[PDB]
Amino acid sequence: YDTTLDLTRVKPYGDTMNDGKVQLSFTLPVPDGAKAVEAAKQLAKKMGLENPMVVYHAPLDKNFTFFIIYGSLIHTVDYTSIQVQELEIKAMSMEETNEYIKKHIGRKVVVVGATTGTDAHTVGLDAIMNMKGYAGHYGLERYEMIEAYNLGSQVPNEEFVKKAIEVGADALLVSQTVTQKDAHIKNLTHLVELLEAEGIRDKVLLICGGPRITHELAKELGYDAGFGPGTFADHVATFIVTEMVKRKIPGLKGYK
Amino acid sequence: QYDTTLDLTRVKPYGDTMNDGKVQLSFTLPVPDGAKAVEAAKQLAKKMGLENPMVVYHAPLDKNFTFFIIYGSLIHTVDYTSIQVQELEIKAMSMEETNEYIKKHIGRKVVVVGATTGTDAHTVGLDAIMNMKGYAGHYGLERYEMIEAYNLGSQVPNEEFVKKAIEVGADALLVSQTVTQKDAHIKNLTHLVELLEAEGIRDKVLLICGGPRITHELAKELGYDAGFGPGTFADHVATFIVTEMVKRKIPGLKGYK
Amino acid sequence: RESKLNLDWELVDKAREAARNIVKDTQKFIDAHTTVSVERTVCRLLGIDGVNDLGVPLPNVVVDHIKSKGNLSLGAATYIGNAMIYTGLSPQEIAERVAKGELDLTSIPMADLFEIKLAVQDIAIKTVEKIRENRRKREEFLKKYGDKEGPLLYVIVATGNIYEDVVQAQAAARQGADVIAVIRATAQSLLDYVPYGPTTEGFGGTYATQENFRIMRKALDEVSEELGRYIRLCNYASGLCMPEIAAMGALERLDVMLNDALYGILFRDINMKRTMVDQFFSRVINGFAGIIINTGEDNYLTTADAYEKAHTVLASQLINEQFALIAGIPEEQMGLGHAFEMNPDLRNGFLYELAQAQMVREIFPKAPLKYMPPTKYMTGNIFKGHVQDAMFNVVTIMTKQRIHLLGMLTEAIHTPFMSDRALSIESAKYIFNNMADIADEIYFKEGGIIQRRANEVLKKAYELLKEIEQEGLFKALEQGKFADIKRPIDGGKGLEGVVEKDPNYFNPFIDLMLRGD
Amino acid sequence: RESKLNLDWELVDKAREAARNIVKDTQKFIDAHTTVSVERTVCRLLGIDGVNDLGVPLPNVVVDHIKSKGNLSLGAATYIGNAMIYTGLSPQEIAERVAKGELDLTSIPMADLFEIKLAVQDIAIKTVEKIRENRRKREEFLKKYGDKEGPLLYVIVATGNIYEDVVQAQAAARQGADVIAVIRATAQSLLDYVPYGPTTEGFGGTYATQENFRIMRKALDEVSEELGRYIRLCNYASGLCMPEIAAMGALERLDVMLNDALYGILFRDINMKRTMVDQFFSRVINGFAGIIINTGEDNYLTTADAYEKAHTVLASQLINEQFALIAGIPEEQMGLGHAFEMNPDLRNGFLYELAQAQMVREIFPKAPLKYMPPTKYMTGNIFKGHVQDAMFNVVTIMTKQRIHLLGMLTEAIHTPFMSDRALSIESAKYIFNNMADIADEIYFKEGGIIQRRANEVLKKAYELLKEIEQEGLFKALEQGKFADIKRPIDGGKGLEGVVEKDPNYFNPFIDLMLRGD
Ligand code: B12
Numbered sequence A: 001y002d003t004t005l006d007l008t009r010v011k012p013y014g015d016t017m018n019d020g021k022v023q024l025s026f027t028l029p030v031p032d033g034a035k036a037v038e039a040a041k042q043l044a045k046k047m048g049l050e051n052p053m054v055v056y057h058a059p060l061d062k063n064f065t066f067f068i069i070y071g072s073l074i075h076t077v078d079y080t081s082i083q084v085q086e087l088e089i090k091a092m093s094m095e096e097t098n099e100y101i102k103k104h105i106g107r108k109v110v111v112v113g114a115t116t117g118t119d120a121h122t123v124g125l126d127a128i129m130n131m132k133g134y135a136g137h138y139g140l141e142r143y144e145m146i147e148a149y150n151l152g153s154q155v156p157n158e159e160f161v162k163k164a165i166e167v168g169a170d171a172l173l174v175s176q177t178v179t180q181k182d183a184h185i186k187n188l189t190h191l192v193e194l195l196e197a198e199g200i201r202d203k204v205l206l207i208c209g210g211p212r213i214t215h216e217l218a219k220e221l222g223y224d225a226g227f228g229p230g231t232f233a234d235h236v237a238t239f240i241v242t243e244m245v246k247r248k249i250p251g252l253k254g255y256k
Numbered sequence B: 001q002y003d004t005t006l007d008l009t010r011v012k013p014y015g016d017t018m019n020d021g022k023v024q025l026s027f028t029l030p031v032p033d034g035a036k037a038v039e040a041a042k043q044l045a046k047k048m049g050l051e052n053p054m055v056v057y058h059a060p061l062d063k064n065f066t067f068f069i070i071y072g073s074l075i076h077t078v079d080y081t082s083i084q085v086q087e088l089e090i091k092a093m094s095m096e097e098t099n100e101y102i103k104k105h106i107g108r109k110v111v112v113v114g115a116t117t118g119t120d121a122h123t124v125g126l127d128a129i130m131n132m133k134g135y136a137g138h139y140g141l142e143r144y145e146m147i148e149a150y151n152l153g154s155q156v157p158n159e160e161f162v163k164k165a166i167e168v169g170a171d172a173l174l175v176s177q178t179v180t181q182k183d184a185h186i187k188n189l190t191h192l193v194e195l196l197e198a199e200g201i202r203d204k205v206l207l208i209c210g211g212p213r214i215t216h217e218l219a220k221e222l223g224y225d226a227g228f229g230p231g232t233f234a235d236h237v238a239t240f241i242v243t244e245m246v247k248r249k250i251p252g253l254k255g256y257k
Numbered sequence C, D: 001r002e003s004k005l006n007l008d009w010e011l012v013d014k015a016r017e018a019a020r021n022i023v024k025d026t027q028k029f030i031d032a033h034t035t036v037s038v039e040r041t042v043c044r045l046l047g048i049d050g051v052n053d054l055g056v057p058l059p060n061v062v063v064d065h066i067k068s069k070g071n072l073s074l075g076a077a078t079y080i081g082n083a084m085i086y087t088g089l090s091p092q093e094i095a096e097r098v099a100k101g102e103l104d105l106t107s108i109p110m111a112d113l114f115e116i117k118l119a120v121q122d123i124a125i126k127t128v129e130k131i132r133e134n135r136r137k138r139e140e141f142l143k144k145y146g147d148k149e150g151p152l153l154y155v156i157v158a159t160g161n162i163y164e165d166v167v168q169a170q171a172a173a174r175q176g177a178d179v180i181a182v183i184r185a186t187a188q189s190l191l192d193y194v195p196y197g198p199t200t201e202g203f204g205g206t207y208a209t210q211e212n213f214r215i216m217r218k219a220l221d222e223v224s225e226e227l228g229r230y231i232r233l234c235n236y237a238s239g240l241c242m243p244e245i246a247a248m249g250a251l252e253r254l255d256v257m258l259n260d261a262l263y264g265i266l267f268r269d270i271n272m273k274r275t276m277v278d279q280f281f282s283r284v285i286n287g288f289a290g291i292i293i294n295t296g297e298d299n300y301l302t303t304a305d306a307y308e309k310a311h312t313v314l315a316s317q318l319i320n321e322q323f324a325l326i327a328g329i330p331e332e333q334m335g336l337g338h339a340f341e342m343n344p345d346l347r348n349g350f351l352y353e354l355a356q357a358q359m360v361r362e363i364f365p366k367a368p369l370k371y372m373p374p375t376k377y378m379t380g381n382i383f384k385g386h387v388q389d390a391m392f393n394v395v396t397i398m399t400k401q402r403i404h405l406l407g408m409l410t411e412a413i414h415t416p417f418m419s420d421r422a423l424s425i426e427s428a429k430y431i432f433n434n435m436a437d438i439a440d441e442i443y444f445k446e447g448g449i450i451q452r453r454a455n456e457v458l459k460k461a462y463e464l465l466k467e468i469e470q471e472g473l474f475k476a477l478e479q480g481k482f483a484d485i486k487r488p489i490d491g492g493k494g495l496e497g498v499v500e501k502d503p504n505y506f507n508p509f510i511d512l513m514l515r516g517d
């Protein structure tokens, strides 16, 4: 093969330019043996490896085999015309969010979350705010630059806003789970009305949460976004910091 | 979401659950590291059949090289029931495999006597096959535990070669020829075969040619048991000798005068 | 004493004194209070099980009935035994009657306490005999198979359905795992009840239910007979149902389980007082049942600077050891945990990790210490992750750690594949075989880096423990001494579930398991 | 002396005595004989270079002429000086005349030997001054950039084309390699001549030619200025041209060079007399030039039982050291090599490898010892191969080996990719940083496995050396004491190239380099 590099035909690299040496490793659910090796080589041949050779194969169980394969890929990628997808946005890491807060904001992001009304459901907001988080996604209070305050299950809206004012909360988290007779939307509207009457609807992000609430519903009720059952703590932290830097809102520490 | 029931006609890889197809890649692109390189790697992995390749890791090996590790779910399936095993596995045996073969199928050490007979002075070819560092990491017949290699020299007359083979009781004889001026190698090999025939010991022993201009067809035409060209290593010769001494029962010259 | 780190044994004695005094001051509170979960565990140990029509476990129904309509300060045993003497029904059918609303435990005329104590005693004794027989059976199995002397390879399976967990655990066992832990469903520490029956669904893992324990133990016994070596089963107990899950493990013969005193307070915001009260009963049950108790010190060093927070881990280990001792757990059942969680870019970091591991091994010479893999500094580079796991195994084998949570080279990207688990097991076997007797050969230079590091960490831990003792345990937790997190003593979940014991309160099982056998 | 292995220093002294006596007995033969390659090196050091119309190097032409037409026992310097006196031309012009057939060195009338010596002395002195300048230049570079305390990462790069080898070596140096060895074209040890000019194609590596050395050194100097740290260059010298390649390396300022004394005899079937005469002059040149001399004991343990053949490696190392000392090489330039070649399935195998490495380090305290990776038991399982490489690095840093030939996780399947080399370098740097001062911390148990293993290997090596001394080196080689291969004294290649020195034999470079400075 020609060893000159062509940027319209970028190909993997082994020890010589313009070859295709690539490495694979996968487990097939078949008993080990010659037939398993042939199956692995045929499978890797469909992926585009020209001369797939099973470097290694060993039985993980009576019906599982682990393979390592090397081959010269035939496919090529047009690097010169490749365009970067700027739309790729993802939740920041823990330390990434910490340094983001430290850079773009002097203060610690004060977050006050609480289930309000008569709901006893708190495993969601605890999944968001507790140190161990949820499925390895540590909660907001684990973050160095966040002062998370969790007020519990049955917190009346008056107590919630009072605690937010007392602590100087930059953002407020409300969790609603029981949707019987649409009691959740009623309580959320009451919360927004109380905040607006207090004159401090601004100055604070007002995020919503729950299993049967969606961004459309939150925006309908006047909340700054709302997170459904699939949310983790890093999602909430990324939103709470990004939307706070975008809209430069002052925490309630400046409210007397 | 996908069906988790195993089907041997559509066998996919298996990372954590049946029929997820998870596989792991790793390759170097000749591209400067960055978002452009990550996108190029993802696009390349999509051509291989990965559904949602994710660049687990990327780091610049150089200002113009990047190393990637990718995980993704393969779309392709292999019909495991229809797989047919083939006898084309003619891989050359390893050193330990050859030693075990000799132990099992022969109760003796295989005596090999090699030399560059005639006036030809070229010996690097035969030394690449018979000496212990071998050639390009392929150790020679002498390093084999169950082989008694006897490299004689560079310009040994055929008479001396045959005499030494009789003296040592050689099971196989290796002759190297490279200088083809006026077909000198042809004449010399023919003379050696004629001398063995006259001695009446053409049987009882294997005859193998070698050199840059020696091919199996030419060797068989001359009357030898195969001949190895420029691309041969020591394992090839060891495997051939060991296999052919069992396929054909070769009574090494130790029983001869 | 014999030490490769030339430890200041007077300093270690002082630290143990401080930890014991802390635990004694905390115990002054624990012995005067009980919690809802403790009473529910008392209900379970008397034979109450199942769920009502709405799915609420019957122990929950009975205990909440007694609390809302009566005086829970007298204990669930008092009311259950009073009903037993009054109507003659077995406790399970008494619970069924209460769930159906036919029987009101508080309206029955209360009999004299002595008669109630006699009435419940036979059931309590039979349950205790069941747990003792389970311990004896585990000992018989371990004697039959002759367990290994090297580290136990500890693996994890989290498919989320029990009937698949059995298959994955059997595969891992056949691959070489000696201890198999089924990841409890995420955030189950926040549930005030233990679900019922086998669970075919769950996020992050399978729920900790008694039927799941039964299924898993039967399945693992099959493979233990197949392979001719005992295979242990592990699960989690922390959080708002600690005594209940401990009782379920004791009745189903779990071999190990995570029982950390401070985990609930620090990392789940469980109420300070409730966690301490129910941890006592949970650990009493575990110690009587012969279960090995693991601790979650690894949480301290994750997302934190492991070089500056080693003394906090040591102090937590000492406090946990003392909390286990006050509950009757032998030192051979205290699987105190610590992690190989230092920065791989730190020069001489391996020396510091070795120093800390050897120091822990020295202070707790009998404990089946658990050592955990690096997770904070793992990356997508699976090869360097494999090398880091190799170093982790090297430390494990050098310092004679008993239990060894295998690290996975793909820890930073996803839950391990079967191939990743096999590779990790192979690497661990290779390193443990090549360095089988390295721990005996290696010694450390007097006054060297390792000894100085161990002494420094020990001094810091002693100072922290003395400060905590001066402050008090609850005050210290409030001040943020542990995991740099401040916990109000009146905040957290489950504060309403703590009730001060009545003078006539009685619990037969505390006496049966602490003083018997 | 100070030892972590509690070595029997009396036994070590006895073994050194035996090795020195063996080398002394061989030196009686060596001093009375020369070879054709030594004369060709003398020709090269006098300025003869190039090729004739047929491509035969001019030193080969001149030495063949002198041998066939005249008496080579007088040395090539004698005839070259006679030609210089008679014709007045420089040695290069004399060589060109001889190649063209216009001159006959043997038919010229012979001048007095004193005139011959005076005529050759100026050119000899100029060449020696050039070599001194190269040595001082290397010292200046090392002083300028400073030399790292830790092990030097040694990598191998070869593609058959020098102009691509420069690119590969520069990339490797930028990746972190401290020593770069261009793998010589395989089987070049059997050539009786050193090819001429740059090499654009080759099999299994790149030929060792002076132009290739110059090109590589220029490229590596550029990269060394770029990176601000000195990158060393290594190549091979063994086999039928040892003195010539040594001279070329000295003139082109190579930093390391494989110059094993016994390699040619055992693994290439070169006649022992020729190899022994060649290695003396090769090592004299290398020692004068300040080049570190590596040895190839790693070949001993390949395909052999590393546990049973440990003592043979030590005996070979002692003999090689004693052969280097007689040539004037300081102990600081004796890069004695040994490999991490024990079975990974052997229990306590790591302890035995550590014992052997520490014993080698203790016996040769000043040597820049070279440690080589495992290759016999490397397989296609790249992950376990990476773990084996990690253990190899661990031993390297634990025993303070100077040069460290990096192993590759893909060593068993193909020549390393750039990614594989990067991964190996990353893992080695990680392990060397995390265990920077481990060698100082650890000491070994008295009478433990490690000390007993070291003593056993030392006793076996002493017994083998005593046997070889009793037999003599040539007879011992004939009896297969080394690498279980029997070598006839009169067999092998190049026996015809050995000529007994005349009483009036003349070689100025031996005196200038051995007795200089
Ligand atoms: C556990 C549970 C309880 C527990 C909760 C314990 C506790 N400590 O909080 C208790 C015992 C209190 C309970 C009680 C009741 N329950 Co209930 N309970 C459940 C159950 C089994 C699980 C709920 C849960 O915690 N899920 C786990 C968490 C992690 O998920 P999550 O809520 O989705 O949280 C995630 C996201 O939504 C998001 N998130 C949530 N909140 C927030 C907040 C913010 C700000 C953000 C950013 C994100 C966020 O992130 C979280 C992590 O990903 C469900 C059934 C089910 N499996 O779904 C019924 C269920 C929710 N309960 C129900 C009912 C009716 C009740 C009762 C009325 C029953 C009764 N007979 O009285 C009572 C009392 C109601 C009350 N006063 O609240 C119904 C509600 C139906 C409806 N249409 O409203 C359900 C759906 C059961 C059913 N199918 O019938 N229950």
Ligand code: B12
Pocket (backbone or CB within 6 Å): B114, B119, B120, B121, B122, B123, B124, B125, B126, B128, B129, B135, B174, B175, B176, B177, B178, B179, B180, B181, B208, B209, B210, B211, B212, B213, B227, B228, B229, B230, B231, B232, B233, B237, D054, D187, D190, D191, D192
């Ligand atoms: C090195 C060399 C020499 C050296 C050899 C040194 C030695 N110790 O053996 C010496 C200096 C002796 C030499 C001399 C001559 N040479 Co010359 N030499 C070469 C050269 C450069 C390389 C040959 C070599 O050894 N290759 C390396 C080995 C490993 O390769 P190999 O022979 O192919 O061996 C492999 C296989 O063939 C096989 N194999 C070989 N033998 C055997 C045996 C057995 C039993 C088996 C199983 C396999 C086997 O396995 C080996 C490993 O893979 C070649 C050019 C070239 N690069 O090809 C010319 C070349 C071979 N020589 C040539 C000639 C003509 C000569 C001279 C006659 C020139 C002269 N003016 O006098 C002289 C004298 C030869 C004589 N006296 O008979 C010609 C031959 C041309 C032809 N038409 O036949 C060549 C091709 C150069 C040319 N293109 O003009 N030479």
Ligand SMILES: C[C@H]1O[C@@H](n2cnc3c(N)ncnc32)[C@H](O)[C@@H]1O
Pocket (backbone or CB within 6 Å): C054, C055, C056, C057, C060, C192, C193
């Ligand atoms: C709301 C969900 O929680 C469970 N459930 C309902 N009431 C209770 C209770 N008081 N205590 C515990 N669990 C309860 C049932 O599973 C129901 O579906």
Ligand SMILES: C[C@H]1O[C@@H](n2cnc3c(N)ncnc32)[C@H](O)[C@@H]1O
Pocket (backbone or CB within 6 Å): D054, D055, D056, D057, D060, D192, D193
């Ligand atoms: C046969 C090949 O070997 C080289 N060559 C030819 N004759 C000799 C010799 N006497 N000595 C060394 N090299 C020689 C040339 O390269 C030629 O092509």
